[PDB]
Amino acid sequence: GPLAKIWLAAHWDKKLTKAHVFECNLESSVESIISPKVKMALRTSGHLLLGVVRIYHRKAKYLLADCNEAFIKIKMAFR
């Protein structure tokens, strides 16, 4: 399922590749938690919440890396 990837990000996030992080639609992940097919325990929602935040943090990390490198590339091209 889709929430299975979020679970992995909560507990064992190393299984998630950069490609996994990039592809993850956090918006529909959140709708999957917010409106589940079957009501879920407070414990499970807490895990799923951290997983979503963890994938989100990794997107920011990769994007900051790529922005820094793009800025270095451009000013290097100036000289």
Binding site: E27, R43, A60, C67
Partner: protein, 405 residues
């Protein structure tokens, strides 16, 4: 997912390398005389898997080493080999080996022969559905007693842990801290994209200036940098949208949080009745709340009574019934029961046996008993023998088993 095999060495009475014959995926019963080493075998398994053995002072660690004559034992290990055809463990292997090795100043886990941290092992088992907040994948006579003699208040706190109140509060705090440092990343991203953007404006004026009449490399790759900038912008927008949907999620969760706790309580009580009804055909039982300040048990074997005013054997069965209910609310792929039938009538031991028989169709059970009712629900039989002050475990027959009880 189940326990395929256990290997022990140097651990309490199991001095020598002990390779236990691989378990059945259903019900395995371990029998043997008093002081043969049944409890030590369960200790070996909780030592690898249970959170209460995760932090050990040196004196506690040394207490697990074999003590006896002959050469002095100074290291021990216990290895659990899991069947993972489930892929319930997030490891892409059909078998997964988890070994814990201890010495004078060594306490080291190995996952498929590679050092991992205890934090890893905890996460690994949480991935698979073993929650630190459920103390009941492993049930011992101590746990049954501690349940039968708990204050109505301590029952409340237990069910809240199981419900997830501590977990949610902890996950929520971790998320907020992680959210907060992500915001600093997002700010740096935005400043960087602005610096890139001013470089693109400079390049554009430099390009028109030469057209109306700064290294050439930058002018050559201007369209490239502008195309690349949009790819970063699109990912930056996704972060902005993700921030909104996460804030919405945290709000929804804080608001549903009490209905979520109440949802779990209502199901635990419901299984409690169905479990007591199956165990004691006739009567029934139910939970009740406090001033809430506590959770209480009221039960009648007759076709109501408070907890204390009950037979010490009946207190044992009711608490065990509640443990079964908590388990069904939060089921796991295998269970370890150490002499859970010690303090039970013969009639009720067969009731528990008949239950496990049904449960063993879909989960593995590894149990020890000193009484013969549970032998009827078992699929593989193991005998513990204690000779020269060391324990051994062998596969025995059903007939042999009725002989170590």
């Amino acid at each position: 997912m189940y326990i395929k095999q256990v290997i022990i060495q140097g651990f309490r009475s199991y001095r020598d390398q002990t390779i236990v014959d691989p378990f059945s995926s259903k019900h395995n019963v371990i029998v043997g005389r008093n002081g043969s080493g049944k409890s030590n075998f369960f200790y070996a398994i909780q030592f690898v898997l249970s959170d209460e053995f995760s932090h050990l002072r040196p004196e506690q660690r040394l207490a697990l080493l074999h003590e006896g004559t002959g050469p002095r034992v100074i290291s021990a290990f216990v290895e659990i080999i899991f069947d993972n055809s489930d892929n319930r463990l997030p490891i892409d292997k059909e078998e997964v080996s988890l070994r814990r090795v201890i010495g004078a100043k060594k306490d080291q886990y190995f996952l498929d022969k590679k050092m991992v941290t205890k934090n890893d092992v905890m996460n690994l088992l949480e991935s698979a559905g073993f929650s630190r907040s459920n103390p009941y994948y492993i049930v011992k006579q101590g746990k049954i007693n501690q349940m039968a003699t708990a204050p109505d208040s301590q029952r409340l706190k237990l069910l809240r842990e199981v419900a997830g109140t501590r977990v949610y509060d902890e996950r929520k705090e971790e998320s907020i801290s992680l959210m907060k440092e992500t915001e600093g990343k997002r700010e740096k991203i935005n400043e960087l994209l602005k610096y890139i953007e001013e470089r693109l404006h400079t390049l554009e004026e430099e390009k028109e200036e030469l057209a109306g009449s700064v290294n050439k490399k930058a002018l050559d790759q201007f369209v490239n940098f502008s195309e690349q900038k949009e790819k970063l912008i699109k990912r930056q927008e996704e972060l902005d949208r993700g921030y909104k949907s996460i804030m919405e999620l945290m709000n929804v969760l804080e608001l549903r949080k009490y209905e979520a706790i109440q949802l779990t309580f209502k199901q635990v009580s419901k299984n409690f009745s169905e479990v007591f009804q199956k165990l004691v055909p006739g009567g029934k039982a139910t939970l009740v709340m406090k001033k809430f300040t506590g959770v209480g048990i009221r039960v009648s074997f007759t076709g109501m009574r408070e907890m204390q005013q009950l037979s010490g054997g009946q207190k044992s069965l009711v608490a065990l019934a509640l443990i079964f209910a908590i388990q069904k609310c939060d089921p796991a792929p295998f269970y370890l029961f150490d002499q859970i039938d010690q303090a039970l009538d013969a009639q009720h031991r067969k009731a528990v046996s008949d239950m496990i028989m049904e449960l063993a169709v879909h989960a593995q059970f590894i149990t020890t008993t000193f009484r013969p009712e549970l032998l009827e629900s078992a699929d593989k039989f193991y005998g513990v023998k204690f000779r020269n002050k060391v324990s051994h475990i062998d596969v025995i027959t059903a007939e042999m088993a009725k002989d170590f009880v």
